[PDB]
Structure 1
Amino acid sequence: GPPTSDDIFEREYKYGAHNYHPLPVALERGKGIYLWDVEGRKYFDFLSSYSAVNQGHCHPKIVNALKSQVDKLTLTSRAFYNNVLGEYEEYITKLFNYHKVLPMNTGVEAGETACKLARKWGYTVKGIQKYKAKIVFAAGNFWGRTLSAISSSTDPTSYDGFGPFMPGFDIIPYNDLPALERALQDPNVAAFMVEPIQGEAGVVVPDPGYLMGVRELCTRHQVLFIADEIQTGLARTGRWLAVDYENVRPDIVLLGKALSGGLYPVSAVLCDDDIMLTIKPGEHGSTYGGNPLGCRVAIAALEVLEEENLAENADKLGIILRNELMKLPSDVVTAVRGKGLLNAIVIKETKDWDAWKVCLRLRDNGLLAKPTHGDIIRFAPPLVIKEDELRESIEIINKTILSF
């Protein structure tokens, strides 16, 4: 017979690194908002791979693009041109209204590319002396697991025991304009990288006006405003970009995750010529970056978000989700927050009952989520979910929470 869920857990423990502690569930099928485990049980996916399957699992139009291109050409390396990359570059740069895109594969690679752009721009355009360029980050940031990315983290589990660390990274509190103004008095600051909503930190939503204030301060001190929209972008928060809520145009925009609908690792660095062209030929790249298969997938993935109006759906349905979640008892749910369909609740941890137990029982009742930083449960279903399906999920949440 096939392997059971426990067999699947047991096998990974024996042969795979122990760098995760996943929730005890073993999935083998996904379609739209639903996942199925190897026992055949059906679950609502309320994580969406942390917003990488915004378009739902195995969306037929993205699947069709992958199957069609894989019969033609999948990788030449950037030693040669392929016929797809430029069609995708034109499409994505028009869509977000930046002059150029640099293609990469993973979110952290886009972040690393952004820091390289910022330093090279800082040295060659702003006039900072080599190598005094600084990049400022916000406490609670997450942008990946390279040595550079953990060097800016304030989470000791990310960086403790992995040093020495990348120099030139300063940290200030999130959602704090006086702190950014103070930090930007240093003329050697080249960039400030920030998430419009902090995902891994627990859907930390900054106050209204924060992104407007970041834009103004960065311009006033000619610092590059790097917006990490790898988790918040692509309709998840109710707009094409989370920064659209404040009509703000960052200097560099990072995309990833849902850029492929979950079918391929595709990430992107968007910015205008004055920044993008400080990197000259031979000075940056990637084996798989810009390959034609990922490019066909990402075009189709972006078309799904636009043609199915997923941003407005995420907006309307996010209002319903948060209003219903706020009806839960304060003794159990300490906070509800989010924008669009990127939301989270905070569980009043005791000696016994905590967010991990809630997620175990959510799983028992047919809904999959997971805690972050202990007491914060993220609720982030695919943007293709319908109102009826959302309300059925809310009743699962209510049944679970009100069962303790």
Structure 2
Amino acid sequence: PTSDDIFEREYKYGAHNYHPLPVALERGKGIYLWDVEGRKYFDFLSSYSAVNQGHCHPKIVNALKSQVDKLTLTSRAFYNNVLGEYEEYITKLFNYHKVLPMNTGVEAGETACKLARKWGYTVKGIQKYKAKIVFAAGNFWGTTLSAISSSTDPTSYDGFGPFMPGFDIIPYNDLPALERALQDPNVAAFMVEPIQGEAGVVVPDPGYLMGVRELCTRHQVLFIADEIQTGLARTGRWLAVDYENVRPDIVLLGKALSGGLYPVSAVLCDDDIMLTIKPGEHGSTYGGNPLGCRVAIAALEVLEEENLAENADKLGIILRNELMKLPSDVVTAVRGKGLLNAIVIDAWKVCLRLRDNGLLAKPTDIIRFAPPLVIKEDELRESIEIINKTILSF
């Protein structure tokens, strides 16, 4: 089938919850994607930061192909041989006692909210059901009814109420607002992204995450760090929170935890939080399955073995420096850490022409530039010239 045929078939038989950029891909490998006409493209979205390791990374592929012949799903009604090996590996990597395995990023966020409330009631001693969770304006952590209840984007929540109670919102990047909010003794947790991704790569000021950690500790509130997009080398560190040497109470991972080969998400925290949830209190059919666990071990090993944090750091400096040379009259701002970057400009027309010139990006007047972390400098510099050609063609 042709590209238009592909667009039309989805239009007929699939829900219209997305309006994708009109490009139809059939193969991907490393930093590249090819459409059905055979044209090649640089991938500068990385599937919302899930293919940090590049598309179809052979080590992760090999892990999938090995385990799929053995065993793919027991459910957690029984034990399998893989899960505990993955749990020991990942908990030691990030230095938390335990992990709770789930499948999608929003599932990890839901899990963290349950953890926070159960901890609020049974350890902090908040009365049922007065526990509150604080969120930052611009947050994105998924599309469930709980997740849209904390959103400040009307596209997410308008028309879908009534909303989950017990969720408060303050501005991002704002320590006085957090301090004022945590005067309320019924707050159990503050959940926040170290860099807000879907909001448009909003980078907070130096010292913000240090201040969050101090304030949360000072008021005995759990600091939930959502690293589903910012984590796993994307910003030039293992976790973006590492830039300020801050240790959250709960860390969320997803997306690139599998290199894009399987939906695997993780909730990391110590025993004093994790063991508030008892047997039977939190279930998921596929969470912790052995196929996804093998895939995730390999996906994490790739990030470590190939020094992708260091590459993302070095190449991100080059990327932002060159984007800053774009005319201030057309590109109003450049921002990012590592290889999570964006420019401010419409943005859709820009992305259509980037596509024409061989580079795939999507707007979120903001264009995100997030290639896989396995990109090399010469490939990055070639990509930058496509961005320049495109911006300078208007």
CA deviations on 1:18-66 (whole Å, 9 max, x unpaired) are 0000000000000000000000000000000010000000000000000
SS at match of 1:205: coil
| CA–CA distance in structure 2, aligned partners of residues 216 and 285 of structure 1 | 33
Cα displacement (A) at 1:189 = 0.1
Which stretches of structure 1, 4 residues or more, deviate above 3 A after TM superposition? Answer: none
Give me the whole-angstrom Cα distance separating, in 1, the residues matched to 2:72 and 2:327. 52
Partner of 1:124: 122
In structure 1, the residue matched to 2:252 is 254
Q: Distance in 2 between matches of 1:185 and 1:82?
A: 46
Q: Distance in 2 between matches of 1:76 and 1:370?
A: 38
State the 1:363 CA deviation. Answer: 0.1
Q: CA deviation at 1:104?
A: 0.1
Aligned-residue offset at 1:285? 1.7
| Cα deviations by residue, 1:277-296 (Å, 9 ceiling, x for unpaired) | 00000000200000000000
| CA–CA distance in structure 1, aligned partners of residues 383 and 373 of structure 2 | 14
Q: String of CA shifts for 1:283-337, please: whole Å, max 9, x gaps.
A: 0020000000000000000000000000000000000000000000011000000
Within 2, Cα distance between the matches of 1:264 and 1:355? 31
Aligned mates of 2:357, 2:42 — CA distance in 1? 10
**Separation in structure 1 between the aligned mates of residue 154 and residue 169 of structure 2, nearest angstrom:** 14
Other structure's SS at 1:36 match: strand
**Separation (CA, whole Å) in 1 of partners of 2:36 and 2:242:** 41
| 1:368-393 per-position Cα deviation (integer Å, ceiling 9, x unaligned) | 00000xx0000000000000000000
Q: Distance in 2 between matches of 1:129 and 1:112?
A: 21
Counterpart position of 1:393: 383
Aligned residue in 1 for 2:214: 216
Q: State the shift of 1:4 in Å.
A: 0.3
CA distance in 1, matches of 2:354, 2:283: 43
Q: Note the C-alpha offset of 1:361.
A: 0.1
Q: How far does the alpha carbon of each residue in 1:81-139 deviate from its partner, in whole angstroms, 9 at most, with x for none?
A: 01000000000000000000000000000000000000000000000000000000000
Counterpart CA distance in 2 for 1:17 and 1:255 is 28
- Taking the aligned partners of 1:99 and 1:105, their CA distance within structure 2 comes to 20
Note the alpha carbon deviations across 1:344-380, whole angstroms, 9 max, x for none.
0000xxxxxx0000000000000000000xx000000
Give the unaligned 5+ runs of structure 1. Answer: 348-353
Please point out which of 184, 187, 190 is paired with 2:185. 187
Q: Following the alignment from structure 2 to structure 1, what is the Cα–Cα distance between the partners of residues 14 and 386?
A: 33
Deviation at 1:177, TM superposition (A): 0.1
Question: 2: distance between equivalents of 1:161 and 1:328?
Answer: 40
Give the distance between the partners of 2:160 and 2:48, measured in 1 at CA: 25
- Matches of 2:77 and 2:178, distance apart in 1: 42
1:304 matched residue in structure 2 = 302
TM-score normalised by the chain length of structure 2: 1.00
Query: What SS does the corresponding residue of 1:25 show, helix, strand or coil?
Result: strand
Q: Distance in 2 between matches of 1:98 and 1:235?
A: 18
Deviation, structure 1 residue 140 = 0.1
User: Following TM superposition, by how much is the alpha carbon of 1:206 offset from its aligned partner in structure 2, in angstroms?
Assistant: 0.1
Q: Deviations over 1:260-284 (max 9, x none)?
A: 0000000000000000000000000
Deviation of 1:147 (Å): 0.1
The CA deviation at 1:165 is 0.2
**Could you list the per-position Cα deviations for residues 171-217 of structure 1 after superposition, in whole angstroms to 9, with x for gaps in the alignment?**
00000000000000000000000000000000000000000000000
SS of 1:329's partner is coil
- 1:202-237 CA-to-partner distances (Å, cap 9, x unmatched) read 000000000000000000000000000000000000
Match of 1:249, SS? coil
In structure 2, how many angstroms separate the alpha carbons of the residues matched to 1:403 and 1:313?
Answer: 30
Inter-partner Cα distance in structure 2 for 1:330 and 1:7: 40
The whole-number CA distance in structure 2 between the counterparts of 1:241 and 1:38 is 36
Q: SS of the residue aligned with 1:371?
A: coil
Measure, in 1, the Cα distance between the counterparts of 2:48 and 2:240.
15
How far does residue 153 in structure 1 lie from its aligned partner after superposition? Answer: 0.1
Task: Report the 3-state secondary structure (helix = DSSP H, G, I; strand = E; otherwise coil) of the residue aligned with 1:226.
Answer: strand
* Structure 2 unmatched ranges of 5 or more: none
Q: Residue in 1 aligned with 2:98?
A: 100
When normalised by structure 1's length, the TM-score is 0.97
- What CA RMSD, in Å, does the superposition of the two structures yield over aligned residues? 0.2
Query: For the residues of structure 1 that align with 2:283 and 2:369, how far apart are their CA atoms?
Result: 35
Q: Distance in 1 between matches of 2:47 and 2:4?
A: 22
SS in 1 for 2:21: coil
Sequence identity, in percent?
Answer: 100
Tell me what 2:143 maps to: 145
Task: Give the 3-state SS of the residue equivalent to 1:24 in structure 2.
Answer: strand
Q: Distance in 2 between matches of 1:367 and 1:60?
A: 23
